[PDB]
Symmetry: D2
Subunit: 68 residues, 4 copies
């Protein structure tokens, strides 16, 4: 598994907490605490960090029409 915290930050600014939790499988309280900056990315498990990196990768690869 690979994790990239820059991808996780991109994710946290580019989708809603509901969509991140539903599309990544990560629990709603973890995603809300990340968005509120009540808990740090650095202290997540590698497993969580991988799920959020993968979702970020997939969403970034949506066609250019759905960007900007």
């Amino acid at each position: 598994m690979k994790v990239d915290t820059k991808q996780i930050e991109w994710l946290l600014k580019n989708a809603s907490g509901y969509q991140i939790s539903k599309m990544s499988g990560v629990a709603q309280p973890t995603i809300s605490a990340l968005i509120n900056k009540k808990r740090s990315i650095e202290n997540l498990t590698i497993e969580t960090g991988h799920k959020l990196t993968e979702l970020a990768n997939q969403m970034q690869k949506t066609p250019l029409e759905h960007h900007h």
Copy 2:
């Protein structure tokens, strides 16, 4: 410089030769040849492949609607 051919493929599938050339600086005949498969991605130089990889990364990281 880093190159990733998967990113170049994504680029060629998601943007026109005109837009790729205008945003990457690679001459449009090179891009047109890649899109029509008269030239292969694997035979590009590392320098060009890096330019196309950076453009793809940049487009992918543009904020979502």
Copy 3:
């Protein structure tokens, strides 16, 4: 930070808990737990995984 669990597995393969701990600052009991398969790599924090992914990168890039 970046993590690659493959790099971490290579490190646990190629260095002892004492040396990993001593060069990365990760607690030697955490490393031992990884080496006896009491804890998963996936359950380390991202920060710890980043430190171990780096140690592995550094050792791999030492000459020769």
Copy 4:
């Protein structure tokens, strides 16, 4: 295929041309031109760059004692 020019540079400092060439399939003249700067790494093909990046990864992953 992925290319990393630092991995290529590392390889050129850490192994001889004879068998960078011999393990990667790239012709020794290309490797010699790289070693003697005649030619830049950035002008290699992606295909060549991938073979050299791959070899560099493989050689770097050899155990501690061989470093």
